[PDB]
Design an enzyme around this catalytic site. Structure first.
Site, PDB file in Angstrom:
ATOM      1  N   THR A 150      54.242  28.992 -17.132  1.00 31.41           N
ATOM      2  CA  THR A 150      55.425  29.638 -17.694  1.00 31.41           C
ATOM      3  C   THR A 150      56.682  28.796 -17.514  1.00 31.41           C
ATOM      4  O   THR A 150      57.536  28.743 -18.404  1.00 31.41           O
ATOM      5  CB  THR A 150      55.653  31.015 -17.069  1.00 31.41           C
ATOM      6  OG1 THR A 150      55.790  30.890 -15.651  1.00 31.41           O
ATOM      7  CG2 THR A 150      54.476  31.914 -17.357  1.00 31.41           C
ATOM      8  N   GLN A 194      55.711  30.249 -10.219  1.00 30.27           N
ATOM      9  CA  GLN A 194      54.931  30.516  -9.018  1.00 30.27           C
ATOM     10  C   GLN A 194      54.648  29.218  -8.288  1.00 30.27           C
ATOM     11  O   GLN A 194      54.567  29.201  -7.057  1.00 30.27           O
ATOM     12  CB  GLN A 194      53.608  31.212  -9.365  1.00 30.27           C
ATOM     13  CG  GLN A 194      52.661  30.379 -10.217  1.00 30.27           C
ATOM     14  CD  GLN A 194      53.081  30.320 -11.658  1.00 30.27           C
ATOM     15  OE1 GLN A 194      54.175  29.860 -11.949  1.00 30.27           O
ATOM     16  NE2 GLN A 194      52.196  30.716 -12.569  1.00 30.27           N
ATOM     17  N   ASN A 203      48.180  16.123  -6.720  1.00 38.35           N
ATOM     18  CA  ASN A 203      47.472  16.851  -5.679  1.00 38.35           C
ATOM     19  C   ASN A 203      46.174  16.169  -5.268  1.00 38.35           C
ATOM     20  O   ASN A 203      45.790  16.248  -4.099  1.00 38.35           O
ATOM     21  CB  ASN A 203      47.210  18.280  -6.148  1.00 38.35           C
ATOM     22  CG  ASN A 203      46.692  18.337  -7.567  1.00 38.35           C
ATOM     23  OD1 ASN A 203      46.506  17.305  -8.213  1.00 38.35           O
ATOM     24  ND2 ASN A 203      46.463  19.545  -8.066  1.00 38.35           N
ATOM     25  N   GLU A 232      74.194   5.898  -6.250  1.00 41.05           N
ATOM     26  CA  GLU A 232      73.602   4.567  -6.201  1.00 41.05           C
ATOM     27  C   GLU A 232      72.123   4.604  -6.553  1.00 41.05           C
ATOM     28  O   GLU A 232      71.604   3.667  -7.170  1.00 41.05           O
ATOM     29  CB  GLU A 232      73.816   3.943  -4.822  1.00 41.05           C
ATOM     30  CG  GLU A 232      75.250   3.499  -4.549  1.00 41.05           C
ATOM     31  CD  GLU A 232      76.244   4.642  -4.479  1.00 41.05           C
ATOM     32  OE1 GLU A 232      75.816   5.813  -4.385  1.00 41.05           O
ATOM     33  OE2 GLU A 232      77.461   4.362  -4.532  1.00 41.05           O
ATOM     34  N   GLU A 253      57.228  36.318 -13.463  1.00 37.71           N
ATOM     35  CA  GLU A 253      56.174  37.208 -12.993  1.00 37.71           C
ATOM     36  C   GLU A 253      56.619  37.912 -11.721  1.00 37.71           C
ATOM     37  O   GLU A 253      57.155  37.258 -10.810  1.00 37.71           O
ATOM     38  CB  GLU A 253      54.878  36.440 -12.750  1.00 37.71           C
ATOM     39  CG  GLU A 253      54.184  36.016 -14.026  1.00 37.71           C
ATOM     40  CD  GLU A 253      54.582  34.628 -14.475  1.00 37.71           C
ATOM     41  OE1 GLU A 253      55.692  34.176 -14.127  1.00 37.71           O
ATOM     42  OE2 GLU A 253      53.781  33.991 -15.186  1.00 37.71           O
ATOM     43  N   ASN A 293      52.571  21.481   0.512  1.00 36.00           N
ATOM     44  CA  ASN A 293      53.972  21.819   0.326  1.00 36.00           C
ATOM     45  C   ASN A 293      54.801  21.343   1.505  1.00 36.00           C
ATOM     46  O   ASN A 293      55.935  20.886   1.330  1.00 36.00           O
ATOM     47  CB  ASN A 293      54.134  23.325   0.130  1.00 36.00           C
ATOM     48  CG  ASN A 293      53.246  23.874  -0.965  1.00 36.00           C
ATOM     49  OD1 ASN A 293      52.822  25.029  -0.920  1.00 36.00           O
ATOM     50  ND2 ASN A 293      52.944  23.039  -1.950  1.00 36.00           N
TER      51      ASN A 293
HETATM   52  N1  LIG Z   1      54.564  23.577  -6.888  1.00 38.34           N
HETATM   53  C1  LIG Z   1      53.329  24.001  -6.670  1.00 38.34           C
HETATM   54  N2  LIG Z   1      52.366  23.756  -7.612  1.00 38.34           N
HETATM   55  C2  LIG Z   1      51.108  24.187  -7.402  1.00 38.34           C
HETATM   56  C3  LIG Z   1      50.775  24.898  -6.257  1.00 38.34           C
HETATM   57  N3  LIG Z   1      49.427  25.146  -6.338  1.00 38.34           N
HETATM   58  C4  LIG Z   1      48.960  24.674  -7.514  1.00 38.34           C
HETATM   59  N4  LIG Z   1      49.987  24.069  -8.175  1.00 38.34           N
HETATM   60  C5  LIG Z   1      49.906  23.408  -9.485  1.00 38.34           C
HETATM   61  O1  LIG Z   1      50.907  23.977 -10.304  1.00 38.34           O
HETATM   62  C6  LIG Z   1      50.397  24.461 -11.533  1.00 38.34           C
HETATM   63  C7  LIG Z   1      51.023  25.813 -11.883  1.00 38.34           C
HETATM   64  O2  LIG Z   1      51.754  25.754 -13.095  1.00 38.34           O
HETATM   65  P1  LIG Z   1      51.785  26.992 -14.137  1.00 38.34           P
HETATM   66  O3  LIG Z   1      50.434  27.659 -14.117  1.00 38.34           O
HETATM   67  O4  LIG Z   1      52.084  26.448 -15.504  1.00 38.34           O
HETATM   68  O5  LIG Z   1      52.926  28.043 -13.686  1.00 38.34           O
HETATM   69  P2  LIG Z   1      53.900  28.856 -14.702  1.00 38.34           P
HETATM   70  O6  LIG Z   1      54.070  28.254 -16.076  1.00 38.34           O
HETATM   71  O7  LIG Z   1      55.280  28.968 -14.105  1.00 38.34           O
HETATM   72  O8  LIG Z   1      53.312  30.346 -14.924  1.00 38.34           O
HETATM   73  P3  LIG Z   1      51.876  30.930 -14.488  1.00 38.34           P
HETATM   74  O9  LIG Z   1      50.912  30.999 -15.668  1.00 38.34           O
HETATM   75  O10 LIG Z   1      52.062  32.342 -13.995  1.00 38.34           O
HETATM   76  O11 LIG Z   1      51.352  30.105 -13.345  1.00 38.34           O
HETATM   77  C8  LIG Z   1      48.897  24.582 -11.332  1.00 38.34           C
HETATM   78  O12 LIG Z   1      48.193  24.115 -12.454  1.00 38.34           O
HETATM   79  C9  LIG Z   1      48.576  23.693 -10.152  1.00 38.34           C
HETATM   80  O13 LIG Z   1      47.996  22.484 -10.586  1.00 38.34           O
HETATM   81  C10 LIG Z   1      51.761  25.131  -5.273  1.00 38.34           C
HETATM   82  O14 LIG Z   1      51.564  25.774  -4.204  1.00 38.34           O
HETATM   83  N5  LIG Z   1      53.036  24.671  -5.512  1.00 38.34           N
END
Ligand SMILES: Nc1nc2c(ncn2[C@@H]2O[C@H](COP(=O)(O)OP(=O)(O)OP(=O)(O)O)[C@@H](O)[C@H]2O)c(=O)[nH]1
Ligand SMILES: Nc1nc2c(ncn2[C@@H]2O[C@H](COP(=O)(O)OP(=O)(O)OP(=O)(O)O)[C@@H](O)[C@H]2O)c(=O)[nH]1
Lengths: 438, 52, 50, 46, 150, 427
Positions: free
Chosen positions: A145, A11, A206, A254, A71, A228
Site C-alpha cells: 500500500t 506496515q 533482506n 555535504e 490498515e 530492524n
Molecule cells: N520495513 C519493513 N519491511 C518488511 C518487514 N518485513 C517484511 N518486509 C518487506 O516489506 C514488504 C511489505 O510491503 P507492502 O506489502 O507493499 O506494504 P504496504 O503496501 O504498505 O501494504 P500491505 O499490503 O498491507 O502490506 C514485504 O514484501 C517484505 O518484503 C519489516 O518488518 N519492516
C-alpha cells in the site's frame, strides 16, 4: 537548530520506526514515560535530544515523526504497545482500506482524501521547526500500500518546499525472492515516477542481511527483531554527526553535494562492517585495519552485486568512537595502493571522512556487543547494473503476455505508464554504461 | 551424619583410624541385620497366608 | 406459544403459516391462585385486597 | 493462544483505535477517556 | 483399557486391548505371551502370582497400569490360594472418546415437539363450581368499615 | 471498519454453516448460550469482523440462512447453536424443490428473492463497510444452484465493488447421486463463471480417501467432513481478525492470485493432519509442515495435478515462525521441481504469516493453489452433458417449465470455452 522531519509509511514502515525509536530512547536515557530521572537537563529546549525530539514545556519528549498507514492492524498494535504514550495521537494516522498491492490504487483511488490532513500535520510541524534541514522517508518500492501514497506525498513536498534535501531508505525488491507478482509492476512505476524528485536513495536487501545474520552473528532463528534493529543502528550512525559534538563534523548537505557524481544517478549503497556477536567482540580484538578490510569485503554488503563486476566512484566513511586520523589515512592509503579495487578514473580521490568521537551504543535485551570503534560505509559504484537488468528482463515477459492488467484497467488507467517506465529504466542503463565508459 | 561431618578437616587432620574402622563395621552390621529382618517378615506373611 | 417466522405474506394461500420452535424462551413466571391454597382461614391478596 | 495482555486498567486507549470495547454502549459521557474509564470500571458482570 | 491374561502352566503374561469402534487408534495384541521381569534394581527373579491384588499398581517395561477389576473365576482362584482383596475400585471415563460419541449420539434424531389442549379437562369439570365465602376489613380507611364477598 | 456477511444457501450450505459457525465460535471463546468468558484480549477486540453486539455481551452472527425444506432448518435450529442463531434471518418457502434447477431459477425463487434481499440490505446498512460476501452452497444440489445463481447475479449490480468469495461443493466423479446433476451443474456454472471472481470447488471423494489415509477411523460422518472444511475456511479467514506482519484481505489475496478475468477455480489444501498415534509419534517442524502441505495425498479438493501444471500458489502459516525458513523452503520446492510450474511467470509463490496460532497447537498452515488440473473435471461434465443431450431424456420437465434447448447450447458453449482456454494457456 540541527533537526529533521521523519515520515514512515506502511506496515513495513512502522516495523522499523518502532525498532529505531526504541533504540533512540536509550542513548538519551528516555524511559517510556517521556520525563527524565532526577538530574536536570531541560531548559530552552536546547541540548542533544532536540535534534530528534521536541521536548515541550510539559517535559514530555514528543518525536517529530509521522506514521501513516492505510490498515488499522499495525497502527492499533503500535498504539497498544508499551511506547504508546510518547507518540503524538493523530501524528499516527490510519485508514481503513488497502491498495491490494496495486500502486495505482495506493496513489489514486484513496490517497487523495488523506493527503489533506497529511499536509496539515506536516506544515504544523514545519512551522515550529527552526532549521528543517531534511526529510527521512521510510517505505518500500514493492509496497503493497505504501508505494503510491509515498510517491504522491513526496511529489507534494517537492512542489511546495523546493529547498531542502530528501533521503530515502527502502527495502529493495529482493532479486530472486518475490512475495507476489506485483513487485516488478509497482517497483518500476515508483522508480520512474520518483526519478526526478528523489534526492538521495539507499536500498537494502533482506536476503543479504539474513546471510550476514547466520554468517557472523551465527544465530539461525532471528527475526525482524534482529533485522530492524540493525538497520536502526545504521540510521543512528548516519545521524550521530548531527546529534553529538566531535572533532570534525560532516552534514547531509555535504553528503548530497559529494556522493552524487551527477544528476539522475543518486543510488549508492551502505554497510555497517563490525556486526559481530558479544562473545566474539569480547575475546577478539578490534582496530582500524581489519574493520576497513572488512568494509571492503564484498559479501557483507546488503545487495547481491559483485563489485569486481562493477566499479566504484564514491566513498563516505563514518568512524564512530575513539580514533585518530593518522592510522585512518594509513589504512585508506593502503587500500588505494591495493589493486583489485577498481576505481573509475574520474575520481582521483573519492573519500570523505566523518569522525564522531562518541562510541555507539548497546541495547538491553539485544544481541549486539560492546563497541569502541564502528565504521559505516556509504559508497556509490556501478555494480548494481545487474539489478536493473534483472528487473527489466523480468517485466518484459509480463508486458508481453498481458497478465493482471485487468486489475489496473479496471481501476482506471492505460498502458502508457507501463511502457514509459521501461524507457526510463533503459535511460538508466545507458547512462550507467556511459559512466562506466572512461 | 557423623561420618559425613567428620570429612571437613583442613590439611593433615585426618587419621583413617580405629574409630573410622569400627564405624564402618557398624554400618555393615546395620545393613546385614536389616536384610535378615526383611527375610523373616517374608516367611511370616507367607505362613499367615497358609493359616487363612 | 412461541412462533418462529411467517412465510405467508409472500403470497396468499391461507392466512399465512406459523412455524413453531423448540426452546420456548421468554416464558415468564406468573403464578395464579389455584385450588391448593384454599382453607377456612388464610391470607389472600386480591389486587390489593387483604 | 499464548500471548500477553491488553486493555490494562482504566487509564487507557489513546483515541484512534477501531475495535469493540467491552460494554461500550452507556455513552452519555463524552470524552474518550471517560468512556474508557467507565468501560474498564464495569467488568463487574461476573 | 487393557486385558491381562495369566497362564499358570508356564507362568506367563499376555496383555491386549479390546477393539472399540470409531477408536481412531491402533489395537490388537499388545505385549506378547512371555515372562516379564521387574524394573531393574534387580532382575534375576520374575513376577509370581503371590503379588496380585485389585486397586494396586504394576509396571511392565516402563508401562504403568493400575488394577481395578477381576472376574468371578478370579475371585474363586484367589479365595482358593490366599491373597485378600481390598474393596474394588472405580474406573474413569475417557474424555475425548466420551465427548465425541456423546456428540454422535446428539446426532441421533427423534424430531421432537410439544403442544397443548383444553377439551378433555374442560368437559371433565364442565358445569361445576365451588362456593366459598370471605370477608374484607375496611375500617383501615377512615370512611369504610366492612363488606362481605363470595 | 471492515466486516463480512455470510450466505448459507441450500441444504448443503445449511449444515456447512452449522459446523463452520460453531467452529469459529468455539475457537473464539463464546459459549453456546451467549455469555462470553473473558480469556483473550485480541479475539475480544477483532470479534467485530463477524459478530455484532446485542446487550449484555450476547453476539448476533451476520449470517443469512436460506432453504426451502422446513425440516432442514428445524434440524439446524435443533443443533447446539440454534439458540445462537436468530429467527430474524430464518426465511423459507412452502414447496418442496425436487432439486430442479429451472424450478429454483424461474418460478418460486422469482418471489422468494425479494424478502431475502430486503433483510440482507437491512443488515448491510446496519454495519459500516463490507469487503464482499462469502457464499456456501452446492452446484450439484438443486435449490442451492437455482437460487444462488439469481442471488449472485442481482447482488453484482446491487454493488459492483465487492468480492464474491464463492464456496461450492462438487459432485463425485464416480457417483453423481442426483441423476440430473449434469444439467444442474452446467446451468449453475454458466452464471458462476460470469458473476464470481474467486471460487473454491470441493469434492468429497478425496475426503473419503483422507478418511482412509490419516483420519484412520473408517467409521466417519458428514459431520467430520464438515469439521475439516469448516477448519479450512476458518484458516482462510483467520488473518483478518489477528495481528502480524502479514496481509489479510481477500482482495490482497485475489489480485495477487488470479491473472485473468476468466480464471476462477481453486483448490483448498490443509496442514498437519494427525492420526491415531502420530500425536506422540510426530515432530511439528518446518520441513515436515512444508512437505505435508505440498504432498499429493494431502491434497483433497479435485484431483492430482500430476497430469498438469501449476499457475499460482498461496500459503498462509499461523505460528511463531521466521521469514527465512519459509523463503528457503520456497526456494527448495522451486528448484526441486522447476518444471512443473509455468515459465510464463516467476515467483508463483504467495505468502502470509499470522502470529496467532490456533487452539491446541503452536504452528499450522493452509494451502490454496491454482493449477491446470480442473480440465479433467469439467471435461467429465462435458461428456456427461453431451451423452445425455443426444437423446433429450428427462427434458419434458424443463420444457414444461418453459425454456429452450438453445440456452443449453450456450451453456455447453461457455463450458467448452473454459476447456479451450485452459488448454490453450497451459499447452
Ligand atoms: N520495513 C519493513 N519491511 C518488511 C518487514 N518485513 C517484511 N518486509 C518487506 O516489506 C514488504 C511489505 O510491503 P507492502 O506489502 O507493499 O506494504 P504496504 O503496501 O504498505 O501494504 P500491505 O499490503 O498491507 O502490506 C514485504 O514484501 C517484505 O518484503 C519489516 O518488518 N519492516
Ligand atoms: N448439508 C449436507 N449436504 C449434503 C450432505 N450430503 C450430500 N449433500 C449435498 O448437498 C447438496 C445440496 O444442498 P443444497 O445447497 O441445499 O441444494 P438443493 O437445491 O437443496 O438440492 P439437493 O439438496 O441436492 O436436493 C445435495 O445435492 C447433496 O449432494 C450432507 O450430509 N449434509
Amino acid at each position: 537548530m540541527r533537526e529533521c522531519i521523519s515520515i514512515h509509511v506502511g506496515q513495513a514502515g512502522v516495523q522499523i520506526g518502532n525498532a529505531c525509536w526504541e533504540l533512540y530512547c536509550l542513548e538519551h536515557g528516555i524511559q517510556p514515560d517521556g520525563q527524565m530521572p532526577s538530574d536536570k537537563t531541560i531548559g530552552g529546549g536546547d541540548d542533544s535530544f532536540n535534534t530528534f525530539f521536541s521536548e515541550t514545556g510539559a517535559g514530555k519528549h514528543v518525536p517529530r515523526a509521522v506514521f501513516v498507514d492505510l490498515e488499522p492492524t499495525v497502527v492499533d498494535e503500535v498504539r497498544t504497545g508499551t511506547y504508546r504514550q510518547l507518540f503524538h495521537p493523530e501524528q499516527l494516522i490510519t485508514g481503513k482500506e488497502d491498495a491490494a498491492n496495486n500502486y495505482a490504487r495506493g496513489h489514486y483511488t484513496i490517497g487523495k482524501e488523506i493527503v489533506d490532513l497529511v499536509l496539515d500535520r506536516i506544515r504544523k510541524l514545519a512551522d515550529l521547526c527552526t532549521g528543517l534541514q531534511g526529510f527521512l522517508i521510510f517505505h518500500s518500492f514493492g509496497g503493497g500500500t505504501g508505494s503510491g501514497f509515498a510517491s504522491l506525498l513526496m511529489e507534494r513536498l517537492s512542489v511546495d518546499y523546493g529547498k531542502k534535501s530528501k533521503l530515502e531508505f527502502a527495502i529493495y525488491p529482493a532479486p530472486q525472492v518475490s512475495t507476489a507478482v506485483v513487485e516488478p509492476y509497482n517497483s518500476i512505476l515508483t522508480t520512474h515516477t520518483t526519478l526526478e524528485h528523489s534526492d538521495c536513495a539507499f536500498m537494502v536487501d533482506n536476503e543479504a542481511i539474513y546471510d550476514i545474520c547466520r554468517r557472523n552473528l551465527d544465530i539461525e532463528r532471528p527475526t525482524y527483531t534482529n533485522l530492524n534493529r540493525l538497520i536502526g543502528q545504521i540510521v543512528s550512525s548516519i545521524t550521530a554527526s548531527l546529534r553529538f559534538d566531535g572533532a570534525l563534523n560532516v552534514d547531509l548537505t555535504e553528503f548530497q553535494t559529494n556522493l552524487v557524481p551527477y544528476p539522475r544517478i543518486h543510488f549508492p549503497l551502505a554497510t555497517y562492517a563490525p556486526v559481530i556477536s558479544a562473545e566474539k567482540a569480547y575475546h577478539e580484538q578490534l582496530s582500524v585495519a581489519e574493520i576497513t578490510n572488512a568494509c571492503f569485503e564484498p559479501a557483507n554488503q546488503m545487495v547481491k552485486c559483485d563489485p569486481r563486476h562493477g566499479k566504484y566512484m564514491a566513498c563516505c566513511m563514518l568512524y564512530r568512537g575513539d580514533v585518530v586520523p593518522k592510522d585512518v589515512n594509513a589504512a585508506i592509503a593502503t587500500i588505494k595502493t591495493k589493486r583489485t579495487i577498481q576505481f573509475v578514473d574520474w575520481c582521483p580521490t573519492g573519500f570523505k571522512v566523518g569522525i564522531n568521537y562518541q562510541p555507539p551504543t548497546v541495547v538491553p535485551g539485544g544481541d549486539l556487543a560492546k563497541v569502541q570503534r564502528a565504521v559505516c560505509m556509504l559508497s556509490n559504484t556501478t555494480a548494481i547494473a545487474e539489478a536493473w537488468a534483472r528487473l527489466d528482463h523480468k517485466f518484459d515477459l509480463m508486458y508481453a503476455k498481458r497478465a493482471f492488467v485487468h486489475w489496473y484497467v479496471g481501476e482506471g488507467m492505460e498502458e502508457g505508464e507501463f511502457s514509459e517506465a521501461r524507457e526510463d529504466l533503459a535511460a538508466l542503463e545507458k547512462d550507467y554504461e556511459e559512466v562506466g565508459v572512461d | 551424619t557423623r561420618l559425613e561431618t567428620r570429612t571437613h578437616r583442613p590439611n593433615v587432620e585426618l587419621c583413617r583410624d580405629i574409630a573410622q574402622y569400627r564405624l564402618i563395621k557398624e554400618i555393615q552390621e546395620i545393613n546385614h541385620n536389616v536384610a535378615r529382618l526383611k527375610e523373616t517378615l517374608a516367611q511370616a506373611q507367607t505362613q499367615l497366608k497358609a493359616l487363612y | 406459544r412461541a412462533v418462529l417466522n411467517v412465510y405467508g405474506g409472500l403470497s396468499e394461500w391461507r392466512a399465512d403459516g406459523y412455524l413453531l420452535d423448540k426452546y420456548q424462551l421468554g416464558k415468564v413466571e406468573q403464578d395464579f391462585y389455584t385450588d391448593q391454597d384454599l382453607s377456612i382461614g388464610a391470607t389472600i391478596n386480591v389486587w390489593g385486597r387483604k | 493462544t499464548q500471548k500477553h495482555n491488553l486493555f490494562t486498567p482504566e487509564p487507557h486507549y489513546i483515541p484512534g483505535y477501531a475495535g469493540f470495547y467491552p460494554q461500550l454502549r452507556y455513552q452519555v459521557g463524552n470524552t474518550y477517556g471517560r468512556t474508557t474509564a467507565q468501560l474498564l470500571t464495569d467488568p463487574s458482570v461476573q | 483399557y487393557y486385558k491381562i491374561y495369566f497362564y499358570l502352566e508356564d507362568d506367563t503374561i499376555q496383555v491386549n486391548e479390546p477393539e472399540v469402534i470409531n477408536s481412531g487408534l491402533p489395537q490388537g495384541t499388545s505385549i506378547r505371551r512371555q515372562r516379564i521381569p521387574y524394573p531393574p534394581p534387580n532382575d534375576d527373579q520374575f513376577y509370581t502370582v503371590y503379588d496380585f491384588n485389585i486397586n494396586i499398581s504394576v509396571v511392565f517395561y516402563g508401562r504403568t497400569f493400575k488394577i481395578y477389576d477381576c472376574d468371578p473365576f478370579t475371585k474363586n482362584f484367589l479365595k482358593k490360594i490366599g491373597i485378600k482383596l481390598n474393596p474394588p475400585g472405580q474406573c474413569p471415563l475417557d474424555p475425548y472418546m466420551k465427548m465425541r460419541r456423546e456428540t454422535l449420539e446428539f446426532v441421533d434424531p427423534f424430531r421432537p415437539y410439544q403442544s397443548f389442549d383444553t377439551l378433555k379437562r374442560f368437559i371433565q369439570y364442565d358445569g361445576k363450581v365451588l362456593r366459598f365465602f370471605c370477608l374484607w376489613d375496611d375500617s383501615t380507611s377512615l370512611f369504610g368499615d366492612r363488606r362481605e364477598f363470595v | 471498519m471492515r466486516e463480512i456477511v455470510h450466505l448459507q444457501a441450500g441444504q448443503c450450505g445449511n449444515q456447512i454453516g452449522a459446523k463452520f459457525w460453531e467452529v469459529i465460535s468455539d475457537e473464539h471463546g463464546i459459549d453456546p448460550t451467549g455469555t462470553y468468558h473473558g480469556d483473550s484480549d485480541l479475539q475480544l477486540e477483532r470479534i467485530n469482523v463477524y459478530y455484532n453486539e446485542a446487550t449484555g455481551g450476547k453476539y448476533v452472527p451476520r449470517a443469512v440462512l436460506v432453504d426451502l425444506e422446513p425440516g432442514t432448518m428445524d434440524s439446524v435450529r435443533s443443533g447446539p447453536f440454534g439458540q445462537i442463531f436468530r429467527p430474524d434471518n430464518f426465511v423459507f418457502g412452502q414447496s418442496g424443490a425436487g432439486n430442479n434447477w429451472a424450478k429454483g431459477h424461474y418460478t418460486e425463487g422469482a418471489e422468494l428473492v425479494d424478502s431475502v434481499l430486503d433483510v440482507v440490505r437491512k443488515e448491510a446498512e446496519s454495519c459500516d463497510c463490507l469487503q464482499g460476501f462469502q457464499l456456501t452452497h452446492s452446484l450439484g444440489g438443486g435449490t442451492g444452484s437455482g437460487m444462488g445463481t439469481l442471488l449472485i447475479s442481482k447482488i453484482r449490480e446491487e454493488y459492483p465493488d465487492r468480492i464474491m468469495n464463492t464456496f461450492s461443493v462438487v459432485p463425485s466423479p464416480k457417483v453423481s447421486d442426483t441423476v440430473v446433476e449434469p444439467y444442474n451443474a452446467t446451468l449453475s456454472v454458466h452464471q458462476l463463471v460470469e458473476n464470481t471472481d474467486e471460487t473454491y470447488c470441493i469434492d468429497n471423494e478425496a475426503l473419503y480417501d483422507i478418511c482412509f489415509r490419516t483420519l484412520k477411523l473408517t467409521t466417519p460422518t458428514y459431520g467430520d467432513l464438515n469439521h475439516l472444511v469448516s477448519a479450512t475456511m476458518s484458516g482462510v479467514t483467520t488473518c483478518l481478525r489477528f495481528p502480524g506482519q502479514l496481509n489479510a484481505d481477500l482482495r490482497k489475496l485475489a489480485v495477487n492470485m488470479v491473472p485473468f478475468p476468466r480464471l476462477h477455480f481453486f483448490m483448498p489444501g490443509f496442514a498437519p493432519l494427525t492420526s491415531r498415534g502420530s500425536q506422540q509419534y510426530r515432530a511439528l517442524t518446518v520441513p515436515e509442515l512444508t512437505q505435508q502441505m505440498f504432498d499429493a495425498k494431502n491434497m483433497m479438493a479435485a484431483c492430482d495435478p500430476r497430469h498438469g501444471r501449476y499457475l499460482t500458489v498461496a500459503a498462509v502459516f499461523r505460528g511463531r515462525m521466521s521469514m527465512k525458513e519459509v523463503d528457503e523452503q520456497m526456494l527448495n520446492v522451486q528448484n526441486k521441481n522447476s518444471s512443473y510450474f509455468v515459465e510464463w511467470i516467476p515467483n508463483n509463490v504467495k505468502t502470509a504469516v499470522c502470529d496467532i496460532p490456533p487452539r491446541g497447537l503452536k504452528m499450522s498452515a493452509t494451502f490454496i493453489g491454482n493449477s491446470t488440473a480442473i480440465q479433467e473435471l469439467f471435461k467429465r461434465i462435458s461428456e456427461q452433458f453431451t451423452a445425455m443431450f443426444r437423446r433429450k431424456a428427462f427434458l419434458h420437465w424443463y420444457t414444461g417449465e418453459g425454456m429452450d434447448e438453445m440456452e443449453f447450447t450456450e451453456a455447453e458453449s461457455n463450458m467448452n470455452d473454459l476447456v479451450s482456454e485452459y488448454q490453450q494457456y497451459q499447452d
